[PDB]
């Protein structure tokens, strides 16, 4: 069997050695990447949505990495990449994110809840939606300089090629695995929610992605794939760019 199950349907599967993807399947199969370090570190790379999830999650890391130190990176503002930090800290974790991902999601934690509940469509979600309170990362980086980690000389590259799916998105990079975390810029079918893109730049961000010798690209949402992940996204984003005529 390819996948193992978790509590509140995530699903974690192995990619390749140290490295799983943890996706949640009741939020809109959001991918996490969960990394460990030849040193013991675990890298947790964006969040599930909510608190149960993320708690489930960390079980799950607990039991079966026992790391000496985790340290999770958010990936944009939005609750796939902001949703976890409440367990994250709680759970000891070190969280971090660019200085603009913490400043819209304080701006987002001031809209109203109910209102933005009605995004989702099932009442059980929008409870545990409700149920959680999404807070920043505990440590920032200024966005345009991004962070390098090191993890004795194991490195995890933080960048921002532009704004994309939002003004804010970063990836993460795997030197050693040659393995990049794309997150919700790349979209190789179609954009999704636009409600913070940036059409016009997409293609332009997606292809400072070319540059990354990736073996495996990982988007925040759906199956990964290969370097062809980047070009597809290209192609999306100018395709929309032409039917929106800007
Ligand atoms: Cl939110
Ligand atoms: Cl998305
Ligand atoms: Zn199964
Ligand atoms: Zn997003
Ligand atoms: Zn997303």
């Not at 050695?17 to 809109?28: H, L």
């Not at 409440?86 to 994110?97: D, F, H, L, N, V």
């Not at 099932?122 to 962070?147: C, M, T, W, Y």
Request: hydrophobic share 40%; aromatic share 8%.
């Amino acid at each position: 069997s390819d996948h193992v199950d978790l509590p509140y349907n995530l699903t974690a599967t192995k990619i390749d050695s140290d490295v799983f993807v943890v996706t949640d399947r009741d939020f809109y199969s959001s991918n996490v990447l969960v990394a460990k370090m030849l040193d013991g570190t675990v890298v947790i790379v964006s969040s599930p949505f909510e608190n149960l999830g993320t708690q489930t999650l960390m079980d799950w890391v607990a039991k079966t990495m026992k790391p000496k130190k985790v340290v999770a990176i958010n990936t944009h503002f939005h609750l796939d990449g902001t949703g976890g930090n409440e367990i994250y800290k709680k759970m000891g974790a070190e969280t971090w994110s660019s200085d603009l991902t913490k400043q819209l999601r304080l701006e987002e934690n001031k809209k109203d809840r109910i209102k933005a509940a009605e995004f989702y469509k099932n009442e059980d979600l929008k409870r545990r939606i409700l149920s959680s309170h999404p807070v920043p990362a505990d440590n920032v980086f200024d966005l345009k300089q991004g962070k390098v980690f090191s993890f004795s000389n194991e490195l995890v590259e933080v960048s921002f090629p532009g704004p994309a799916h939002s003004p804010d998105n970063v990836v993460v990079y795997f030197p050693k695995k040659k393995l990049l975390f794309g997150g919700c810029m790349i979209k190789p079918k179609e954009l999704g929610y636009l409600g913070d893109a940036n059409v016009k730049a997409w293609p332009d961000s997606a292809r400072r992605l070319k540059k990354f010798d990736a073996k495996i690209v990982i988007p925040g949402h759906g199956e990964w794939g290969g370097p062809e992940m980047v070009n597809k996204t290209i192609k999306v984003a100018e395709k929309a760019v032409g039917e929106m005529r800007l």
